[PDB]
Each structure stands twice: as C-alpha cells, then as structure tokens.
Amino acid sequence: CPLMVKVLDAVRGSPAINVAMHVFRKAADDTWEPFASGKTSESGELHGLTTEEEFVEGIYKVEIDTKSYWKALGISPFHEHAEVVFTANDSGPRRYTIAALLSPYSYSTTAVVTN
Amino acid sequence: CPLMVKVLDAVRGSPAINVAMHVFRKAADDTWEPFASGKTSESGELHGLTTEEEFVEGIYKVEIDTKSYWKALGISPFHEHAEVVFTANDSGPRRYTIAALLSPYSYSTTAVVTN
Amino acid sequence: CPLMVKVLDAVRGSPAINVAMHVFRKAADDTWEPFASGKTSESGELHGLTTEEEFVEGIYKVEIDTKSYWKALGISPFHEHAEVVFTANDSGPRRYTIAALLSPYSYSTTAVVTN
Amino acid sequence: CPLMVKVLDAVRGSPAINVAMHVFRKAADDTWEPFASGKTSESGELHGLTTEEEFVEGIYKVEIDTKSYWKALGISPFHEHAEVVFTANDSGPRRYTIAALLSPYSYSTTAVVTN
Ligand SMILES: Oc1ccc(/C=C/c2cc(O)cc(O)c2)cc1
Ligand SMILES: Oc1ccc(/C=C/c2cc(O)cc(O)c2)cc1
Numbered sequence A, B, C, D: 001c002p003l004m005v006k007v008l009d010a011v012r013g014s015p016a017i018n019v020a021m022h023v024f025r026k027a028a029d030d031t032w033e034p035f036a037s038g039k040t041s042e043s044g045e046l047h048g049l050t051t052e053e054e055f056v057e058g059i060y061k062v063e064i065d066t067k068s069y070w071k072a073l074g075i076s077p078f079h080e081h082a083e084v085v086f087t088a089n090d091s092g093p094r095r096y097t098i099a100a101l102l103s104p105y106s107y108s109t110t111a112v113v114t115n
C-alpha cells in the first residue's frame, strides 16, 4: 500500500469512520492538481488511494474534512480541515502511512515511511 | 493582539525560534489572499500579525515553514509546512492563540479561543 | 486482543521497535502490582499482553521505557518513561489499543476502546 | 519560577482552568515523596510550585488530575491522570515549562527547558 491514511477520534476513543478526504499533487504552476480521494472505513483507515507506478515524486496534500466529521456529532470544530503537505518519493518509491488524531480544537498528525 | 502563534520544538525541548509563517485569508473568488507574515521570537511566539479592525470574519490559513526550520538543524523533515485552516470571528470578535508542537515527522496543533 | 500497545517514532517516521514496557494493576493497598510486559515488534506493536479472562476491572498503568529507546539513538530525552494510567473493564470486557507517539521532549498518547 | 505547568483543553479550545495536579520527587528509597501541588489559573497555568533552592536534582513526577476535569464537564474520560516523569537539574539549574493538551481519550505533553 503506497499511501494509507488512518484517522482516530480523541474525544470518543474510536476510529474516525466515514471521514472524507482528497489528495492533491502540486503542479508545475504551483496549483493543486487532483490526485486521489476516499472515505475512511469502519477501522478509520483509507487504503487503495494510489498505486506504486502512479505515485511518483511530488509535493502532495492530504486534505481531511474534519469539519463535517465533528458537525455530524453536533460539535462546532475549530478547523475547516486537517491538511498534511509533504514531498513523497523523492528518493524513489516509499510506502507512507499518514495518521491523524482529531479533537474539536486540535489535531496531531504523524507519518510512517517505509522502504 | 487578536491573533498570536506559538511554536515549540519537541526534539530540543525549546521554543521554535525564527520560524517563518505566512497567514492567508480566503477571498470571495476562493483564492488565498496574503494577510500577514512574520517569524517567531526567542520565546517561539509571533505577536502583532493583525489588528482587531483588520481581522474580520473569514477563513484563514496559517502556513508555518517547518521545513526550513528542520533543514537548518540538519534534519530532512516529512512536511513541507504545518498548516492551520479555520474560520475566525463568525460569531463576533475573538482572540486566537494557535500553538504548534513540531517534530521531524509529526506535528500537533491546537487553538485557544477567548472572548 | 484485549490489550495492544503501538509505539511510533516522530523523529524518524517509523515504528518504535524494541521498546520495552511493563503493565501494572493497582492493588487494594494502592500499590502497583505487576500484570504484564513485553517489547514492541518490528511493527512497533506489542500484542499478547493479557487474555480476556485475566483482564478484569482495575486501574492499569502502562509504563513505556522511552528513555532507553532514545538513549540507544544517542539522544538525551526529557522523560524517564511514558506512562498511561486508565481504568479498564469497568463496564465489562473491552478491547484496548494504546498508541504512543514519541519525541525526545514530548509524547502523545491515545486510546481506541472497542466492544 | 523554575517549574511551571500549562494545561490546554482540546475539546473546548480553552485553557484548562482549575485543573488539580500533584508533583512528587523520588526519594532515596525509590518512593514518591510529595513535593508540591496546586490548581491551574484562568490562563491554564500553575506558577509558584517551587523555588530555585528547593528544586534540586532528582526525578520528578507531575500527576495532572485530568479525570476530575472531564467528569465535571459530563465526560467519562479514559485516563486516571496525565503524568510526566523526568529528571531535572542534573546538569545544573534549569527552568522547566511542562505543557499538556487534553482530550477525553488522549493527551499530548511537552517540555520547554531553558538555561
Ligand atoms: O498524536 C498521535 C498519537 C497517536 C497516533 C496514533 C497513530 C497510529 C498510527 C497507526 O498506523 C496505527 C495506530 O493504531 C495509531 C497518532 C498521533
Ligand atoms: O501537543 C501539543 C501541542 C501544543 C502544545 C502547546 C504548549 C504550549 C506551551 C506554552 O508554554 C504556551 C502555549 O500557548 C502552548 C502542547 C502540546
């Protein structure tokens, strides 16, 4: 799995299920080009975003719609979204897991990068 | 001072000093308009970005140049920047403190919103 | 798996491998009684700490030896250990995943609790 | 003020006010001796715990009563407390700021250590 995103809910102590996100890749004109998207599963995970051949060097942005997630729970959150912007594959293919831990006024994110 | 940003370094146990950041505000055409910028002080704080009169309702993005910070310490970090996107002042004027805690492959961010 | 611990390294962007930890359970005299222990695998995970029948209501403490982990990497960390203290199984059995994200001067921890 | 603790609430986007905490110091017999205690102010800060003369080399534990804080808001949280265990002043006197960011099922903590 070249790119996987895992989302956790720090308020309820659960996977964050049905969280929508889009992935973009920076174009030569510095605009954000659509690249991938999906919703987290019942495990809070989004697999199958891309393939090794398609996922080449670039700057990528994962934009996670945390606002809709909290609004569905009756909570007015701080952020419009959680976004994770990173260069990928600059030294050739790697596997990336992006994790995001969500609270109404805070988020934490980390990456696990494996060869 | 209706908007303050504080940045901390989780590797060295220190304020993150001389960290650059840019603040944008979403324009009516959905583009990001430059709003303010600056660098953190020896306390890791950036004060004086805006004024009560200038800091109107809107969607704001704070883009913290974490990459240059880590590269100056000899570390190749994961993220291009740490970004915080939020709606401000939609129920009237508030004071915002945005805090960010930085590691090479991770960041955590929270907001303190006061009336 | 009634109790699993997952440990991540925010400096290197990797699972935290070979991280030792002990689990204790609070006794009636408020002392900490040994309960379980182990080291994280190459995935940063420690499975098989306990069984459903043995893991009953109590206050549990997971004490993760983060100091030895950082010292092995030539880093002088802040904490002696990362500890996670929680009541478990007070409403009958649950499955617990405890995650810890480690930096030299900081740690973040969350729990996923499932029925 | 060689030791200060600041506590933030990630659910409400506010300082965590009136949060109790106890500080212990490890005695020669490996027991935890009471060292200081207090409650956070309206800014989420607890100042004046100790003095330069009293704050000697040692292993210290800060135990933050996060459980009572969440219970007072109607939330049944995961942790009994958030705790921070660290060696202080072993290379000479330092000033320590311990920060903790709280959610019902998660906490993040960092230290700022200055000379
Ligand atoms: O601040 C943070 C604290 C904890 C975590 C947990 C991340 C994580 C990543 C995985 O691949 C599996 C998992 O069970 C958890 C992320 C951020
Ligand atoms: O994960 C975390 C993210 C952010 C913070 C903030 C800490 C902090 C410490 C201060 O002295 C002042 C402040 O405004 C914030 C702590 C942990």
Ligand code: NA
Pocket (backbone or CB within 6 Å): A090, A091, A092
């Ligand atoms: Na390269």
Ligand code: NA
Pocket (backbone or CB within 6 Å): C090, C091, C092
């Ligand atoms: Na019960």
